[PDB]
Amino acid sequence: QLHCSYESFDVESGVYSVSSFEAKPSGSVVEQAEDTKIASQLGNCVEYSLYGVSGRGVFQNCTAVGVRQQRFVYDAYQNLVGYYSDDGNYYCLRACVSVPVSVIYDKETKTHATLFGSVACEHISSTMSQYSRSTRSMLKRRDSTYGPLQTPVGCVLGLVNSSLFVEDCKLPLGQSLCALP
């Protein structure tokens, strides 16, 4: 993707953003009194329909905000915020979350590594069930043998903990982090 955006076969070294992992849908949750068993399912990213209102998102059990019997709670940008279920419980809706991705490209050695941003390695796995683009196998050529590595900026793949101190990597990851070639 990076090569196509620069229309070239030799992109300059740097850290570059690439498209993010989306969400991954989960089985539907529907409420519309007037079929089972989908009345509730907390929850990950399950598509939903609520009395003809629809969208995709995660539900969570929460407190009780006003006003009840208007059924749909909204924010100032008209995003749905939460819902009153006919089981008498308020639930909140956070829509869904995504994993930002960027890559580390070293043009001199023609090698690369990646960064998942602030997502943390507890949600990172060797294969993905999201998704973004068809493969990441070139990373896997080395990373089939390693666990993900947590860093202060974020979880990364194929970084290795060398604990070296260097003045300038020409590939800083922000903070004090540095991506040596």
Binding site: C4, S5, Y6, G14, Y16, S17, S19, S20, E22, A23, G43, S54, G55, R56, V58, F59, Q60, C62, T63, Y77, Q78, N79, C92, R94, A95, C96, V97, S98, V99, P100, G117, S118, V119, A120, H123, P152, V153, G154, P172, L173, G174, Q175, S176
Partner: protein, 463 residues
Amino acid sequence: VPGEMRLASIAFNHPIQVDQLNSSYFKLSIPTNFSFGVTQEYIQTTIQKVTVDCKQYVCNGFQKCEQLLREYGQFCSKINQALHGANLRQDDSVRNLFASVKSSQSSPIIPGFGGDFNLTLLEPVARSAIEDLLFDKVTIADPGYMQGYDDCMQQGPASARDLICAQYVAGYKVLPPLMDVNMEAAYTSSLLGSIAGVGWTAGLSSFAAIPFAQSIFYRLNGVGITQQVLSENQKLIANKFNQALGAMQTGFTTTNEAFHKVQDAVNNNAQALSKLASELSNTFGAISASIGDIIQRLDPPEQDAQIDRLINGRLTTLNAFVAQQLVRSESAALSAQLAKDKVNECVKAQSKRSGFCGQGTHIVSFVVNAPNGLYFMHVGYYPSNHIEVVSAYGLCDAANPTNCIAPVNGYFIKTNNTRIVDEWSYTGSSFYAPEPITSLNTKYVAPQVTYQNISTNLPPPLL
């Protein structure tokens, strides 16, 4: 309740009027009661770094949109390249600045620094007490990174309302700062230890390593206060200096203009991101703000036309956003250049320039971290209680016209002091205090018609 507003005229404070005189002598205005004070300024050095997943911003995985968007795929490629170049420039302005704030050498920092000077700027061996006040008074949202994304996620409080979690819906990413706050603190502690002093000639090579109090006395003698006064008032000087710094604990309000500028640097960053978020719900005459809904409700011959209307307005918003970021990035780079010059003038040296600090000559200044920039404090000297005295352009021996003298960094005044039997006396240019005229306070000059003729007693030359 309160009454009517009152119309009023803006006051004009008139300057003290010193009478012009002709002849061989002149009236001189000189202060008798100096007081320390502080002024402050905020100089922004960076823009928060942002990137945008342009494919995700325009649509959210809908396949009809993905097919349609490919006709415009080159717009997103231009958008990503432009933002990437802006972010690289922000990183370079930071590294360039920090390369010059660093000193080759410094004193270690210990408690009790400065003797009688209080110096609350010392690190809590950390950041600093003043930096903590700035970060706590500022209303900026708590940073991401750690834990970050898991405060977006359902494993957290129902009350989060952060725009930072909205980044993972909208495809925004705020990049982490380049330096790490701990290294930033280390760079400004190095500046604190370079003080005392930048005198003794240049100061770019050798390091004097003298007590802070000693460097202050040299700076006070560098503004024309005589050394005799400085030795007499040392405790008084320390107390006035501490009172000027004591006011800093009450200075962090929005009525303080420098603080207000810090607050609006934060507000500008938040607003730039909120604009993109509000546009996600903005139809462009399209039937709905949601692509999945507009697909669900339409036959495909109409559906595609509606989506294209929606896509074009979304791309237009991103283009305007990039243009705004490019302008702001440039102004920050220029502002960072100004900060670099003040660190290499106002922090690392006493300044003789006026117009560049507080308006009271210059004496030592300090710098601390603030959001997106540097925050400076300038100690300065403020004159008060001016008196007018008789003064002469110079003195000459009446018996020998070629022996003439003129004061160095001070003035010759008619004596008004009971300790001095001599008809004339020397005083400092920043503070009134008579002293006998001696060779240390004078230089020989060519004779001039306005110099006074002394019929008898002059000590330099005695003859």
